[PDB]
Amino acid sequence: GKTLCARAVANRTDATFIRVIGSELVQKYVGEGARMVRELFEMARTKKACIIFFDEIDAVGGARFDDGAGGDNEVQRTMLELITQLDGFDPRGNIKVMFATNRPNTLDPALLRPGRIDRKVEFSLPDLEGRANIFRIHSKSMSVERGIRWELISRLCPNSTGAELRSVCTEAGMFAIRARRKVATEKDFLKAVDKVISGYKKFSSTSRYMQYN
């Protein structure tokens, strides 16, 4: 829930949220997108108490390197246009800046210099306690027959996401309707833990991040 706590924080702060998609920053002809970024930042300076949330800037934000015949250079113009605005020749006057990256595997080293992205927070996999917390937020929301263990379901699981725990409920809810139960019991929760895990292995849902830039 990379983007889920930043929707939580968008509820709390009540500042402007201006969201960017990194694949939205690439246009047909080169230097068009140069226009876009520059302009967007200066509109946000005029704006008072605002937040720019950089989503999915894995393309457009990537590492700079030379190809000598590429078509990557044309994209790396806009990559540069992101640097030159953040330091500026003036500071950010109340612009709070988030960058959301799937990957630290490739990033710019001047979009990941430590003075303009300040403290940088690794978001982690839930613990054996942390899955129990998540799955209580999720089963308190569901009708279940009282006397259950939310601890049990976490153990059964390996080290895993809570996005699986949001789907342990909902697939258990489909095993709920097939039995023609208004309620959810232990028995259907077991079938569902088996269902998600078998699928994860079959593909390779975790410990994989793809791409190269």
Partner 1 sequence: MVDESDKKQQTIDEQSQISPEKQTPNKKDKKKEEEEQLSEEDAKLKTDLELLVERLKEDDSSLYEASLNALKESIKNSTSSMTAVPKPLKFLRPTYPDLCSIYDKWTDPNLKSSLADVLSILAMTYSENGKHDSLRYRLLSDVSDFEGWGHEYIRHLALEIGEVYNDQVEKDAEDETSSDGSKSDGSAATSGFEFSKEDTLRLCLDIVPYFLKHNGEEDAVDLLLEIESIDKLPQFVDENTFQRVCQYMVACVPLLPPPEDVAFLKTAYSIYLSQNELTDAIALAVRLGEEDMIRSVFDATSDPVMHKQLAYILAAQKTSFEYEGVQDIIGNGKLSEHFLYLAKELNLTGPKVPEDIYKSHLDNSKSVFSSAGLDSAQQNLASSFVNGFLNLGYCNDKLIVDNDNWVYKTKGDGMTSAVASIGSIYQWNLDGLQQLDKYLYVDEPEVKAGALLGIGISASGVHDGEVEPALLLLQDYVTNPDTKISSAAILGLGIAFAGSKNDEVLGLLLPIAASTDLPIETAAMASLALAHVFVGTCNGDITTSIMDNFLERTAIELKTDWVRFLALALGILYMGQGEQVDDVLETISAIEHPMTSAIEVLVGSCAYTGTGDVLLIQDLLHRLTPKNVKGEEDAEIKSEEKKGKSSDKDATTDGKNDDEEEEKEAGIVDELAYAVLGIALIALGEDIGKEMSLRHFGHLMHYGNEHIRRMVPLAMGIVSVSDPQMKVFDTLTRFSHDADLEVSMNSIFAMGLCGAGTNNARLAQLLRQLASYYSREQDALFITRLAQGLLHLGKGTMTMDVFNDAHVLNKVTLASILTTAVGLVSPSFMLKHHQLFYMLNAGIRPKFILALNDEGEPIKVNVRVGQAVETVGQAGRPKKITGWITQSTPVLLNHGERAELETDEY
Partner 2 sequence: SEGTSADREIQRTLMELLTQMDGFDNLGQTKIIMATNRPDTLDPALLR
Partner 3 sequence: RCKLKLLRMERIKDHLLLEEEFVSNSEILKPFEKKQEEEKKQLEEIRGNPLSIGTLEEIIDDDHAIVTSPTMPDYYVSILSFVDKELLEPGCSVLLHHKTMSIVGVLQDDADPMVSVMKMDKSPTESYSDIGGLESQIQEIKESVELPLTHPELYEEMGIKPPKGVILYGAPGTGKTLLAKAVANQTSATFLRIVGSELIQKYLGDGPRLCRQIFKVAGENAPSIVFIDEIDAIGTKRYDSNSGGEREIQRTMLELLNQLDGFDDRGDVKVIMATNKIETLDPALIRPGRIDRKILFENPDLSTKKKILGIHTSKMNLSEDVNLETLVTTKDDLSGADIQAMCTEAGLLALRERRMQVTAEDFKQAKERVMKNKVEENLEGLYL
Ligand X SMILES: Nc1ncnc2c1ncn2[C@@H]1O[C@H](COP(=O)(O)OP(=O)(O)OP(=O)(O)O)[C@@H](O)[C@H]1O
Residue 154, Cβ density class (10 Å: 0-12 exposed, 13-18 middle, ≥19 buried): buried
101: how many CB neighbours lie within 10 A of its CB?
Answer: 19
State in Å, rounded, how far the first CA of the chain is from the last one.
22
Q: Which does 119 bind (CB under 5 to 8 A by kind): partner 2, partner 1, ligand X, none?
A: none
Select the residue interacting with partner 2 from 14, 29, 123, 198 (CB under 8 A).
29
- Indicate the helix (H) or strand (E) that contains 191: helix 186-202
| Beta carbons of 179 and 151 less than 8 angstroms apart | no
Choice from 86, 150, 162, 168 touching ligand X (CB under 6 A): 162
Asked if 166 touches partner 3 (CB under 8 A), the answer is yes
Site stretch for partner 1 (CB under 8 A), options 25-33, 55-63, 90-98, 175-183: 175-183
Q: Quote the CA–CA distance of 162 and 168 in Å, as a whole number.
A: 9
Shortest Cβ 28–partner 2 spacing (Å): 8
User: Exactly one of 21, 43, 49, 163 binds ligand X (CB under 6 A); which one?
Assistant: 163
How far apart CA 11 and CA 147 sit, in angstroms, is 33
Interatomic CA distance for residues 21 and 18, integer angstroms: 10
Residue from 28, 120, 146, 178 binding partner 1 (CB under 8 A):
178
Amino acid making up residue 162: G
- CA 103 to chain centroid: 10
Residues in contact with partner 3 by CB under 8 A are: 3, 7, 19, 21-24, 26-29, 33, 53, 55-56, 58-59, 71-72, 75, 102, 138, 141-143, 161, 163-164, 166-167, 169-171, 173-174, 176-178, 182-184, 195-196, 199, 203-206, 208-213
Residues in contact with ligand X by CB under 6 A are: 1-4, 126, 134, 137, 162-163, 166
